[PDB]
Amino acid sequence: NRPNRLIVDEAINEDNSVVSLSQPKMDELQLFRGDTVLLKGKKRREAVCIVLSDDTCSDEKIRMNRVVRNNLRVRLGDVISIQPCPDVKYGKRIHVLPIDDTVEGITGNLFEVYLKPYFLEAYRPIRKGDIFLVRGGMRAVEFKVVETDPSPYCIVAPDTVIHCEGEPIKREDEEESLNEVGYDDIGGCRKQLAQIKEMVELPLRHPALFKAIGVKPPRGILLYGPPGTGKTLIARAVANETGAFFFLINGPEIMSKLAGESESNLRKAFEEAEKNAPAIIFIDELDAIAPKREKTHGEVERRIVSQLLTLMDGLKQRAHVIVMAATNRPNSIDPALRRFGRFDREVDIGIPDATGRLEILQIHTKNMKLADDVDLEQVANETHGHVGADLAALCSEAALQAIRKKMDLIDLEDETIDAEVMNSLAVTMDDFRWALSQSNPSALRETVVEVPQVTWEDIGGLEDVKRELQELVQYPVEHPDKFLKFGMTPSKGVLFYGPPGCGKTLLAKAIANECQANFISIKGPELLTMWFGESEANVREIFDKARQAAPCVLFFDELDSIAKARGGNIGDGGGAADRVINQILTEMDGMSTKKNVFIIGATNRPDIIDPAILRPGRLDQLIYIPLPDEKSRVAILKANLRKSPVAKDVDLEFLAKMTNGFSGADLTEICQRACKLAIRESIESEIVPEIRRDHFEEAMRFARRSVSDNDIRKYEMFAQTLQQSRGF
Amino acid sequence: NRPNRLIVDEAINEDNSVVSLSQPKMDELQLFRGDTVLLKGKKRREAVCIVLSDDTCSDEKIRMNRVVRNNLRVRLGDVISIQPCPDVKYGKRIHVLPIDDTVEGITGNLFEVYLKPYFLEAYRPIRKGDIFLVRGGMRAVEFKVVETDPSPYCIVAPDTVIHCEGEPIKREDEEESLNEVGYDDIGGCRKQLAQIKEMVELPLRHPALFKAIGVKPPRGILLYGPPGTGKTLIARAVANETGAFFFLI
Ligand SMILES: Nc1ncnc2c1ncn2[C@@H]1O[C@H](COP(=O)(O)OP(=O)(O)OP(O)(O)=S)[C@@H](O)[C@H]1O
Ligand SMILES: Nc1ncnc2c1ncn2[C@@H]1O[C@H](COP(=O)(O)OP(=O)(O)O)[C@@H](O)[C@H]1O
Ligand SMILES: Nc1ncnc2c1ncn2[C@@H]1O[C@H](COP(=O)(O)OP(=O)(O)O)[C@@H](O)[C@H]1O
Ligand SMILES: [Mg+2]
């Protein structure tokens, strides 16, 4: 249907007037990447913009910003027409003025702060119907053109004289503000937007088709995640972005109201928003109003949760609605709300990663001006547990640390301030380092699921067991073609066992990095404290959080501490078991081989373990991690100092010889002392940097075999037969 | 912006009429540490005080007491002007009288208990607009001067004959009492005041700037600690000291 029909999509780049396409559309287009284009759009309102080319788009799709996409009165997923035409020319007048409340409280000269610096060397097209936004000085400014050089197009040149009175504008009746949230105000969530985006999209954009079909569009959604994670943000974003009518319910709000006042208040919310459909209904803190465990005292609270049910279930299809609620943990809410015809969908919005945090940090760092020494790629690596709302108050508190010490000397106090200071005001790296050091980065910290940073090169030796792990994880994910042809079935779990400090934890994080699978780590002590006094109930959740993360490596680390809890050494009269070992391996038997979740245990004392976990179908492959030997003992040293400035004098072949029964962790203990003996001489020297050969000679003096000899023969005995361990 | 612009700060020393500065401001100043200075301040009300020098202040900052800082109608973090001038001279009359309820229940001779022992060998400047406080006898006494030797300055000498009827005064409509809590009535908390002090300060003193900016000033605070630790004290102190309107639940 011709290359006059294009679709809307949301840009990767942040720049104001551009559109990004691909070469197939270019081999359809045959026009430049420096050209101007005049686009046609809905409601007789159209606008002028330029194009470039790039791979991130598909064969056919169109990247835009909101500032473009709003004037065109279009939304993501609309048919647009680029109209590839070269009308190219300069314009003349281009008289602009600021917008109603967008300048409220800021005053003064706008030429050198705003406007001018935005146009320079990047002449930007303009039309009588372009509103645009300029970022700076802690503020988002909005503009409009009542007249310019006559239409359609005007293209600035590094001359053109712009003239502006200032003063507000009349607020446009229907024209949205750009300060309303949209898919660009959310970051780190990319994967769960597209999930929410598909699922809610077409029944909002295409109310008719469903009325034409017998398909039931899912209507109800539950968003998980700990507080401050952006649940309420993601909700309103979608409602704005999709065009829907967004009504909002607070839990406390309707539990604040008088008994019997809530019922009419909760009922009206649907009844009213029934009339305005298509409609979103968002319920903040569903936990407040529907808390069924031992639930509540007295009817009036037990009554309102049954009112909610008869609205969800007793929804007859009404006309058209979709309900969205939010809560901190999936639990604590009445189970009867998750049945079908009620909130059947679930979207778990976890904490962000560093790649997510940098995405967030840039969003709250946009509008403000920064010094050149800032990094923000390092910050994301120094903020560990942080949700989005922590990481926003880390930007706004760092920026108040800047404007206290800067303008206390200016000490100017009046009704409003103008932009020159703000423009010549910046935040430095010393502030971020300061606001990161307060207790504000105190933040919620719980089970994290991520792709690990460790690579294969980060571990030395072990080259064959590296080859065997990729057999057992890489391939069944890579080649589902095979394993049908030859039949059989992949084995699910693995068990590493060996001397302490020999590399088991690392080698589990390496394959996750290799297959880009998520990695969940559950350490024996942590697992056994949540059992607390005689109760846990959270184990089934780490298998859930593993299930919705697939492909996933699920790693049970230092699995020996649990068995020695029941008892170690001499031993009890009984075997080594707890009620938290049993509910693990009921749940292993639960997960299907069609799942690509993959389990790995590790133990430093194979002597003690429960045979139940070795049974075929639980942890079958047994892998014995030996101590390193000379040629590998170089690989270890060669590795962990890869970031250390070692001097040329050293012989790593020589270290590796004098050492024999050292663990890989104890080699790092030598390399550790050497480096800390270096810094003592340097610090002395303040009354030259480079690790020295003599240093390694002194460190090597105090080195310590971490594993005894007489216990090496014990690993060598279990290396042979640990299969025998079950049955007697 | 010239060495006529100084800022307010809270003194380390406890003595009544002094101001503490540093040498960089002195190499800006070039006047004595025994001199008298006449300071200018807000609301057309100003007062006379003397200076010394010390390290505890920064390069540029000014230590005061509340008894100075109130007459000037200023609060910590205001631009003040010291006006380094040597007008030095003695005065003559200096007639003082006690304040409305500040003497309630205490009576009798005030000469040998109050007043006199406070002036001795440490002649203290005085102006028609100085209210001062003397400590002793389980009580905090407050005074004022309706007239003295003509203005601006009067500087006592170890002679000058003060005369006082006694009797209350009319309670000044807006003039704060010195018995209200302030940062000097709290101790051992120095480190967590400065924390609370930064965090609440500018959005109270500068309501406008935030209305001019997109920054969100944190508004809500939780104070921990076991009972009797001074939580309620620290709260009202800040409210008084910062000027804010303090409601209590
Ligand atoms: N092959 C190896 N390559 C690099 N580092 C190693 C290796 N083996 C041990 N290490 C060091 O040991 C530390 C982590 O040891 P792990 O890989 O967890 O071995 P582990 O025996 O499972 O753990 P523990 O605590 O020593 S019982 C790392 O900081 C490494 O410096
Ligand atoms: N993914 C994200 N991207 C950008 N900002 C975020 C994100 N997650 C959280 N925030 C920040 O969190 C703050 C409030 O989050 P909120 O919507 O209240 O989450 P919740 O409702 O889950 O508590 C907002 O200021 C927003 O800036
Ligand atoms: N840091 C402090 N400095 C001076 N006085 C204190 C301090 N902490 C407590 N007090 C004394 O405690 C008394 C009452 O404390 P209060 O304000 O009731 O504390 P809270 O409200 O925490 O119980 C006051 O008389 C005050 O004299
Ligand atoms: Mg380990």
mmCIF file of C-alpha atoms in Angstrom, chain A residues 119-267:
data_model
loop_
_atom_site.group_PDB
_atom_site.id
_atom_site.type_symbol
_atom_site.label_atom_id
_atom_site.label_comp_id
_atom_site.label_asym_id
_atom_site.label_seq_id
_atom_site.Cartn_x
_atom_site.Cartn_y
_atom_site.Cartn_z
ATOM 1 C CA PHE A 119 19.752 26.855 16.558
ATOM 2 C CA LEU A 120 23.478 27.260 16.087
ATOM 3 C CA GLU A 121 25.077 25.399 13.163
ATOM 4 C CA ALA A 122 22.145 23.057 13.110
ATOM 5 C CA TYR A 123 19.605 25.156 11.282
ATOM 6 C CA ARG A 124 16.258 23.755 12.259
ATOM 7 C CA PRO A 125 13.169 23.901 10.013
ATOM 8 C CA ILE A 126 10.087 25.641 11.376
ATOM 9 C CA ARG A 127 6.425 25.906 10.425
ATOM 10 C CA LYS A 128 3.517 28.033 11.668
ATOM 11 C CA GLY A 129 2.335 24.914 13.489
ATOM 12 C CA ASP A 130 5.520 23.910 15.354
ATOM 13 C CA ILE A 131 5.668 24.114 19.124
ATOM 14 C CA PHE A 132 9.075 23.166 20.437
ATOM 15 C CA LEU A 133 10.835 22.566 23.732
ATOM 16 C CA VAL A 134 14.306 23.642 24.817
ATOM 17 C CA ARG A 135 16.054 22.127 27.823
ATOM 18 C CA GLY A 136 18.218 23.977 30.299
ATOM 19 C CA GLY A 137 18.429 25.892 33.545
ATOM 20 C CA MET A 138 16.430 23.303 35.521
ATOM 21 C CA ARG A 139 13.396 24.029 33.345
ATOM 22 C CA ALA A 140 11.588 22.868 30.224
ATOM 23 C CA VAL A 141 10.559 25.841 28.096
ATOM 24 C CA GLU A 142 7.890 25.714 25.397
ATOM 25 C CA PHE A 143 7.424 27.949 22.350
ATOM 26 C CA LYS A 144 5.092 28.636 19.432
ATOM 27 C CA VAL A 145 5.054 30.754 16.280
ATOM 28 C CA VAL A 146 2.120 33.007 15.523
ATOM 29 C CA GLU A 147 3.766 34.177 12.289
ATOM 30 C CA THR A 148 7.061 33.760 10.385
ATOM 31 C CA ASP A 149 8.116 33.995 6.760
ATOM 32 C CA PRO A 150 5.028 32.703 4.920
ATOM 33 C CA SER A 151 4.299 28.983 5.008
ATOM 34 C CA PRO A 152 4.716 25.984 4.780
ATOM 35 C CA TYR A 153 8.405 25.817 5.542
ATOM 36 C CA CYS A 154 11.069 28.094 6.991
ATOM 37 C CA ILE A 155 14.628 26.837 7.440
ATOM 38 C CA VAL A 156 16.973 28.838 9.635
ATOM 39 C CA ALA A 157 20.449 29.796 8.404
ATOM 40 C CA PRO A 158 23.341 30.899 10.635
ATOM 41 C CA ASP A 159 22.127 34.465 10.151
ATOM 42 C CA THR A 160 18.382 34.569 10.408
ATOM 43 C CA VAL A 161 17.157 37.214 12.784
ATOM 44 C CA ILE A 162 14.630 35.918 15.287
ATOM 45 C CA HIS A 163 12.607 38.400 17.290
ATOM 46 C CA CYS A 164 10.554 37.665 20.389
ATOM 47 C CA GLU A 165 8.519 39.838 22.721
ATOM 48 C CA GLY A 166 8.332 37.256 25.457
ATOM 49 C CA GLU A 167 5.059 37.134 27.444
ATOM 50 C CA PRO A 168 2.866 34.034 27.814
ATOM 51 C CA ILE A 169 0.517 32.576 25.263
ATOM 52 C CA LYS A 170 -3.127 31.648 25.533
ATOM 53 C CA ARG A 171 -3.189 28.075 26.763
ATOM 54 C CA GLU A 172 -4.196 25.889 23.857
ATOM 55 C CA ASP A 173 -7.502 24.217 24.693
ATOM 56 C CA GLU A 174 -6.624 20.656 23.670
ATOM 57 C CA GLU A 175 -2.854 20.747 23.073
ATOM 58 C CA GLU A 176 -1.074 18.473 25.525
ATOM 59 C CA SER A 177 1.795 19.691 27.623
ATOM 60 C CA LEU A 178 5.158 18.077 27.033
ATOM 61 C CA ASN A 179 5.651 17.811 30.783
ATOM 62 C CA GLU A 180 3.189 14.945 30.904
ATOM 63 C CA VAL A 181 4.748 11.540 31.259
ATOM 64 C CA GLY A 182 5.277 9.366 28.213
ATOM 65 C CA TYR A 183 7.394 6.417 27.219
ATOM 66 C CA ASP A 184 10.492 8.616 27.301
ATOM 67 C CA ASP A 185 10.130 9.403 30.994
ATOM 68 C CA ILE A 186 10.642 5.772 31.928
ATOM 69 C CA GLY A 187 13.919 3.920 31.678
ATOM 70 C CA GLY A 188 15.362 0.559 32.573
ATOM 71 C CA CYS A 189 11.907 -0.948 31.956
ATOM 72 C CA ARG A 190 12.201 -1.411 28.179
ATOM 73 C CA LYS A 191 11.399 -5.108 28.278
ATOM 74 C CA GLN A 192 8.270 -4.903 30.404
ATOM 75 C CA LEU A 193 6.871 -1.916 28.536
ATOM 76 C CA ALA A 194 6.728 -3.839 25.273
ATOM 77 C CA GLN A 195 4.958 -6.547 27.238
ATOM 78 C CA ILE A 196 2.436 -4.132 28.714
ATOM 79 C CA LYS A 197 2.453 -2.253 25.446
ATOM 80 C CA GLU A 198 1.265 -5.123 23.247
ATOM 81 C CA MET A 199 -1.242 -6.393 25.720
ATOM 82 C CA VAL A 200 -3.180 -3.173 26.339
ATOM 83 C CA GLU A 201 -2.576 -1.537 22.979
ATOM 84 C CA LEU A 202 -5.011 -2.750 20.358
ATOM 85 C CA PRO A 203 -8.144 -2.958 22.562
ATOM 86 C CA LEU A 204 -7.515 0.708 23.319
ATOM 87 C CA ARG A 205 -6.662 1.849 19.793
ATOM 88 C CA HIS A 206 -9.159 -0.440 18.071
ATOM 89 C CA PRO A 207 -12.262 -0.608 20.249
ATOM 90 C CA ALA A 208 -14.246 -1.690 17.210
ATOM 91 C CA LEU A 209 -12.363 -4.825 16.140
ATOM 92 C CA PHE A 210 -13.133 -6.614 19.394
ATOM 93 C CA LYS A 211 -16.778 -5.636 19.147
ATOM 94 C CA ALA A 212 -16.429 -7.291 15.730
ATOM 95 C CA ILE A 213 -14.707 -10.425 17.067
ATOM 96 C CA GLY A 214 -15.368 -13.142 19.623
ATOM 97 C CA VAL A 215 -11.885 -12.795 21.115
ATOM 98 C CA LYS A 216 -11.759 -11.602 24.725
ATOM 99 C CA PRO A 217 -9.115 -8.934 25.266
ATOM 100 C CA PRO A 218 -7.552 -9.403 28.690
ATOM 101 C CA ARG A 219 -8.806 -6.661 30.952
ATOM 102 C CA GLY A 220 -7.003 -6.466 34.242
ATOM 103 C CA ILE A 221 -3.354 -6.172 35.038
ATOM 104 C CA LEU A 222 -1.239 -6.394 38.138
ATOM 105 C CA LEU A 223 2.124 -4.659 38.460
ATOM 106 C CA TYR A 224 4.592 -5.956 41.024
ATOM 107 C CA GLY A 225 7.813 -4.553 42.359
ATOM 108 C CA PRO A 226 9.063 -2.850 45.460
ATOM 109 C CA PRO A 227 8.125 0.754 46.216
ATOM 110 C CA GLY A 228 9.539 3.562 44.149
ATOM 111 C CA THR A 229 10.048 1.313 41.155
ATOM 112 C CA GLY A 230 7.889 3.321 38.778
ATOM 113 C CA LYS A 231 4.589 1.446 38.846
ATOM 114 C CA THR A 232 2.433 4.560 38.983
ATOM 115 C CA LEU A 233 4.636 6.179 36.377
ATOM 116 C CA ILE A 234 4.307 3.307 33.913
ATOM 117 C CA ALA A 235 0.558 3.354 34.348
ATOM 118 C CA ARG A 236 -0.135 7.002 33.619
ATOM 119 C CA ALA A 237 2.450 6.993 30.851
ATOM 120 C CA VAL A 238 0.510 4.335 28.969
ATOM 121 C CA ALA A 239 -2.803 6.113 29.516
ATOM 122 C CA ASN A 240 -1.500 9.407 28.156
ATOM 123 C CA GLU A 241 0.471 7.812 25.349
ATOM 124 C CA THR A 242 -2.368 5.592 24.158
ATOM 125 C CA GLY A 243 -4.997 8.315 24.281
ATOM 126 C CA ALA A 244 -7.220 6.610 26.836
ATOM 127 C CA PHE A 245 -9.184 8.235 29.631
ATOM 128 C CA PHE A 246 -7.261 7.637 32.858
ATOM 129 C CA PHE A 247 -9.122 7.522 36.155
ATOM 130 C CA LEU A 248 -7.166 6.931 39.341
ATOM 131 C CA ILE A 249 -8.136 5.305 42.616
ATOM 132 C CA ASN A 250 -6.047 5.455 45.746
ATOM 133 C CA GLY A 251 -6.353 2.742 48.306
ATOM 134 C CA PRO A 252 -5.930 4.996 51.313
ATOM 135 C CA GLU A 253 -8.191 7.602 49.739
ATOM 136 C CA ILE A 254 -11.176 5.291 49.674
ATOM 137 C CA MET A 255 -10.252 3.691 52.966
ATOM 138 C CA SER A 256 -10.078 7.158 54.466
ATOM 139 C CA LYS A 257 -13.714 7.876 53.659
ATOM 140 C CA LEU A 258 -16.474 7.039 56.080
ATOM 141 C CA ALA A 259 -17.881 3.528 56.214
ATOM 142 C CA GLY A 260 -20.436 3.330 53.438
ATOM 143 C CA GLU A 261 -18.967 6.423 51.851
ATOM 144 C CA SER A 262 -16.351 4.235 50.185
ATOM 145 C CA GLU A 263 -18.822 1.852 48.535
ATOM 146 C CA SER A 264 -20.476 4.683 46.628
ATOM 147 C CA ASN A 265 -17.059 6.157 46.021
ATOM 148 C CA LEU A 266 -15.581 2.924 44.698
ATOM 149 C CA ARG A 267 -18.652 2.037 42.658
#
